[PDB]
Each structure stands twice: as structure tokens, then as C-alpha cells.
Design an enzyme around this catalytic site. Structure first.
Site, PDB file in Angstrom:
ATOM      1  N   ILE A 189       0.853  -1.183   0.000  1.00  0.00           N
ATOM      2  CA  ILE A 189       0.000   0.000   0.000  1.00  0.00           C
ATOM      3  C   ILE A 189       0.897   1.245   0.000  1.00  0.00           C
ATOM      4  CG2 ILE A 189      -1.688   1.436   1.278  1.00  0.00           C
ATOM      5  CD1 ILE A 189      -2.999  -1.226   2.253  1.00  0.00           C
ATOM      6  N   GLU A 217       3.973   3.671   2.729  1.00  0.00           N
ATOM      7  CA  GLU A 217       4.833   3.832   3.898  1.00  0.00           C
ATOM      8  C   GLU A 217       4.047   4.391   5.079  1.00  0.00           C
ATOM      9  OE1 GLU A 217       8.779   4.230   4.666  1.00  0.00           O
ATOM     10  OE2 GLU A 217       8.326   2.208   3.910  1.00  0.00           O
ATOM     11  N   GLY A 218       4.589   4.158   6.273  1.00  0.00           N
ATOM     12  CA  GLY A 218       4.143   4.786   7.514  1.00  0.00           C
ATOM     13  C   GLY A 218       5.314   5.362   8.292  1.00  0.00           C
ATOM     14  N   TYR A 275       7.034   4.093  11.024  1.00  0.00           N
ATOM     15  CA  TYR A 275       8.083   3.145  11.426  1.00  0.00           C
ATOM     16  C   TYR A 275       8.277   1.981  10.474  1.00  0.00           C
ATOM     17  CZ  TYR A 275       7.081   5.852  15.577  1.00  0.00           C
ATOM     18  OH  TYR A 275       6.820   6.875  16.439  1.00  0.00           O
ATOM     19  N   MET A 322       6.860   0.023   6.368  1.00  0.00           N
ATOM     20  CA  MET A 322       5.909  -0.310   5.298  1.00  0.00           C
ATOM     21  C   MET A 322       4.515  -0.732   5.786  1.00  0.00           C
ATOM     22  SD  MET A 322       6.648  -3.216   2.512  1.00  0.00           S
ATOM     23  CE  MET A 322       8.110  -2.314   2.014  1.00  0.00           C
ATOM     24  N   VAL A 323       3.464  -0.325   5.038  1.00  0.00           N
ATOM     25  CA  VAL A 323       2.099  -0.828   5.195  1.00  0.00           C
ATOM     26  C   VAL A 323       1.725  -1.646   3.939  1.00  0.00           C
ATOM     27  CG1 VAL A 323       1.101   1.411   4.458  1.00  0.00           C
ATOM     28  CG2 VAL A 323      -0.338  -0.276   5.589  1.00  0.00           C
ATOM     29  N   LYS A 353       0.659  -3.057   9.319  1.00  0.00           N
ATOM     30  CA  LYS A 353       1.765  -2.122   9.359  1.00  0.00           C
ATOM     31  C   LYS A 353       2.965  -2.728  10.056  1.00  0.00           C
ATOM     32  CE  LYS A 353       0.146   0.911  13.129  1.00  0.00           C
ATOM     33  NZ  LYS A 353       0.136   2.345  13.532  1.00  0.00           N
ATOM     34  N   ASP A 391      -3.968  14.755  17.041  1.00  0.00           N
ATOM     35  CA  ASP A 391      -3.497  14.870  15.668  1.00  0.00           C
ATOM     36  C   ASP A 391      -4.553  14.473  14.657  1.00  0.00           C
ATOM     37  OD1 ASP A 391      -1.535  15.605  13.762  1.00  0.00           O
ATOM     38  OD2 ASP A 391      -0.540  13.648  13.790  1.00  0.00           O
TER      39      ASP A 391
HETATM   40  C1  LIG Z   1      -3.991   6.265  10.771  1.00  0.00           C
HETATM   41  C2  LIG Z   1      -3.497   5.521   9.542  1.00  0.00           C
HETATM   42  C3  LIG Z   1      -3.624   4.005   9.646  1.00  0.00           C
HETATM   43  O1  LIG Z   1      -3.814   3.484  10.743  1.00  0.00           O
HETATM   44  N1  LIG Z   1      -3.505   3.240   8.493  1.00  0.00           N
HETATM   45  C4  LIG Z   1      -2.640   3.675   7.378  1.00  0.00           C
HETATM   46  C5  LIG Z   1      -3.382   3.589   6.057  1.00  0.00           C
HETATM   47  O2  LIG Z   1      -3.857   2.260   5.812  1.00  0.00           O
HETATM   48  C6  LIG Z   1      -4.531   1.709   6.855  1.00  0.00           C
HETATM   49  N2  LIG Z   1      -5.343   0.700   6.492  1.00  0.00           N
HETATM   50  C7  LIG Z   1      -6.046   0.101   7.467  1.00  0.00           C
HETATM   51  C8  LIG Z   1      -5.969   0.473   8.797  1.00  0.00           C
HETATM   52  C9  LIG Z   1      -5.137   1.506   9.163  1.00  0.00           C
HETATM   53  C10 LIG Z   1      -4.390   2.155   8.182  1.00  0.00           C
END
Ligand SMILES: *CCC(=O)N1CCOc2ncccc21
Ligand SMILES: *CCC(=O)N1CCOc2ncccc21
EC number: 2.7.11.24
Length: 346
Positions: A21, A23-24, A26, A28-29, A44, A139
Site C-alpha cells: 500500500i 509507507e508509515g 516506522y 511499510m504498510v 503495518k 493529531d
Molecule cells: C492512521 C493511519 C492508519 O492506521 N492506516 C494507514 C493507512 O492504511 C490503513 N489501512 C487500514 C488500517 C489503518 C491504516
């Protein structure tokens, strides 16, 4: 073990068919197929930095998200890590897969008034639960609001969250702040550490404005420019609201500025529902003491189609941090992460 875009992403055998998907903070997602629940999930990766050094914000978020249970707050479904502290390195956090987020949706899509109304309701419904636990998100912004294909909304990223502490909110003028600049309330720049619930309502107000026009309302380019964007729309604060700022450097900065006229909300948002603009006005109030609270916002006429306090749950008890998470030696923080994630081991 499985690999994604050159990087180890070691979640199997339960989770397979990984798709990068992005980056985050800390790591990769990815999305992955959960072979137990027979649905795709989001995962994540959290890697420690340098020598076995995790971030307190990882522990903070895990503790909060494991305690909270609410339809409009992202949950943690699973946590993958090695069975021992000595072997523990990457931590993978498994959560519900969500199609998109409000940042992506606002870059690409005009929202109907019905969608803006429904999104705002769900943000405030989740926020009611967060604030009922005596927690501040700190945030809130479009990228931290996840949406699924049916527009169900879930708040995410509790890395900057804190227990509310209004008696310790005061600080000097130009105190550095961590949360995303465009969504910072005016008082952050003047005299506030962001330890009161009113900090989050300001961010919601900014999000509502952004939903009305697809543009951030206050896109400051640097710390003090954020305040000047705010004053450029709300206008100069009143004598009464200035008298509330006892700190002289903050007060005198505001007194030094030329008079700035208020920009009427209906001129900025000529296509907006009049009730949405009345609620926006109340969330984007300069004086945090005069700013509407979450439960009042829910009860505002704009949200009359949705408002149902019996279906707007609150937390069973206030949330408390057992340790002060900024005090911690890196070994103690790794130990605490290991312990907090134990329930997901078989
Ligand atoms: C707050 C962002 C987060 O928790 N993410 C990043 C984006 O993708 C994602 N998919 C499912 C659940 C959480 C996230
Ligand atoms: C600093 C004083 C202040 O904020 N006040 C004064 C009276 O008006 C008012 N209404 C609501 C909340 C706070 C205040």
C-alpha cells in the site's frame, strides 16, 4: 519468509498475498489475505531504530487501541512478533482493511452535503468516546480518518494521544509543538500545550472546512504563519478574548498586529449548508473556553438526522497510563511493548 519491494514483510503463514500500500512512520504498510477470517486486512510493520530502540508512541497507541472498543475507532485485530524479547525485532500490527482515507478522498472527490454531514457525525461520535475516556487524540486530520467502500469512518493514529490535563495546559509564547501544523488551534502558538479537549474540536472544525471546499482552511507554511492564517479569517480577537491570555509575550504579540477583519463563513463557503456553517463557527472559535464541546456538537441542528445519544457510546472508565512513557529507558520500553502484545501469542 515473504518479501515486498525489497523489504522483509514477515507475517505469514496466516497472512498471504501481500500488496504494497505505502509507507508509515516506522515501516511499510501492506494489505494481506487473512486465512483465518477469510478477508483482506491491513498490516503495518514497526521496526526499531538503531540499537533495539522503539518509540514510546508505538506503545502509547497499542495501549489505547487495545483498551478502546468503538465502531468509529480503528481496532487492533492481531499483533505479530517473535516469541521472546531476545528474538523480538519487527512488530506487525494487523487492522481492518479500509478502502481509503479522507486525505485521499478530498484530493480526488467532491463531497455531497450528505457525505459531509455523515462523515462529521462519525468523527464526532468517535471523538465523544475518546474524550469520555479522558483522552485527547491531538493529531486529527484527514489522513487519520479511514473510510471503507460504504463510507464507514474510523479514526486512527493515536501516537500523539495524551490523557487530558487542563490544570497543566499553560505554557509560554512560541512553545514548540509536535502535531500537524495546519490543524493546530490558535492557543498552541500562544499559551497552550494541547492538554484540553478543545484542542481536538479545533482540528475537527478544520476538517469540516476542508470537506466543504477540498482545500485546507489554514495552510500555514511555518509555526507563526499558522496563527496569521487563523487571524486572517476569524479576524482580530476581541478585547475580552485577549484579556484571557495572561502571558504578556503572547498578549503583546496579538496587540502588535494590524486590525484584521473577519471573513464571513458564507463568503468562504458559498455552496455550504447554513447549519454546517453555524456549527463550523462554533468549532472554530478563537477562545478555547467558548469553543463548542463534542457532545454539544453532536446535538447541533446540522446533525439532527443522526444525533442519538443512546447510540453514541462512552468508555467504561477513564484511561490511565501506568508509566510515564517519556521517562523510559529503551530496554524498559521494549519490555513493555513485548508485554502489551502478549495476548496475541498462541
Ligand atoms: C492512521 C493511519 C492508519 O492506521 N492506516 C494507514 C493507512 O492504511 C490503513 N489501512 C487500514 C488500517 C489503518 C491504516
Ligand atoms: C478568559 C475569560 C473567558 O474565557 N470567559 C469570560 C466570560 O465569557 C466566557 N464564556 C464562556 C467561556 C469563558 C468565558
Amino acid at each position: 519468509p515473504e518479501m515486498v519491494r525489497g523489504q522483509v514483510f514477515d507475517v505469514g503463514p496466516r497472512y498471504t498475498n501481500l500488496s504494497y500500500i505505502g509507507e508509515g512512520a516506522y515501516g511499510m504498510v501492506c494489505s494481506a489475505y487473512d486465512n483465518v477470517n477469510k478477508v483482506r486486512v491491513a498490516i503495518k510493520k514497526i521496526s526499531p531504530f538503531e540499537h533495539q530502540t522503539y518509540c514510546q508512541r508505538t506503545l502509547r497507541e497499542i495501549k489505547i487501541l487495545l483498551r478502546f472498543r468503538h465502531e468509529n475507532i480503528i481496532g487492533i485485530n492481531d499483533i505479530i512478533r517473535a516469541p521472546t524479547i531476545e528474538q523480538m525485532k519487527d512488530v506487525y500490527i494487523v487492522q481492518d482493511l479500509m478502502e481509503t482515507d479522507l486525505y485521499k478522498l478530498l484530493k480526488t472527490q467532491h463531497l455531497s452535503n450528505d457525505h459531509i454531514c455523515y462523515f462529521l457525525y462519525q468523527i464526532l461520535r468517535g471523538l465523544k468516546y475518546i474524550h469520555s475516556a479522558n483522552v485527547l487524540h491531538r493529531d486529527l486530520k484527514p489522513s487519520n480518518l479511514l473510510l471503507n467502500t460504504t463510507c464507514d469512518l474510523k479514526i486512527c493514529d493515536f501516537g500523539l494521544a495524551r490523557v487530558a490535563d487542563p490544570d497543566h495546559d499553560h505554557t509560554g509564547f512560541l512553545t514548540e509543538y509536535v502535531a500537524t501544523r495546519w490543524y493546530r488551534a490558535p492557543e498552541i502558538m500562544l499559551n497552550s500545550k494541547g492538554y484540553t479537549k478543545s484542542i481536538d474540536i479545533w482540528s475537527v472544525g478544520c476538517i469540516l472546512a476542508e470537506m466543504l471546499s477540498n482545500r485546507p482552511i489554514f495552510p500555514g507554511k511555518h509555526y507563526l504563519d499558522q496563527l496569521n492564517h487563523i487571524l486572517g479569517i476569524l479576524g482580530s480577537p476581541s478585547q475580552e478574548d485577549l484579556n484571557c491570555i495572561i502571558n504578556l509575550k503572547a498578549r503583546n504579540y496579538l496587540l502588535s498586529l494590524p486590525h484584521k477583519n473577519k471573513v464571513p463563513w458564507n463568503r468562504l463557503f458559498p455552496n455550504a449548508d447554513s447549519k454546517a456553517l453555524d456549527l463550523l463557527d462554533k468549532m472554530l472559535t478563537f477562545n478555547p473556553h467558548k469553543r463548542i464541546e463534542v457532545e454539544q456538537a453532536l446535538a447541533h441542528p446540522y446533525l439532527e438526522q443522526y444525533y442519538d445519544p443512546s447510540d453514541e457510546p462512552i468508555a467504561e472508565a477513564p484511561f490511565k497510563f501506568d508509566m510515564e512513557l517519556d521517562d523510559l529507558p529503551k530496554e524498559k520500553l521494549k519490555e513493555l511493548i513485548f508485554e502489551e502484545t502478549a495476548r496475541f501469542q498462541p
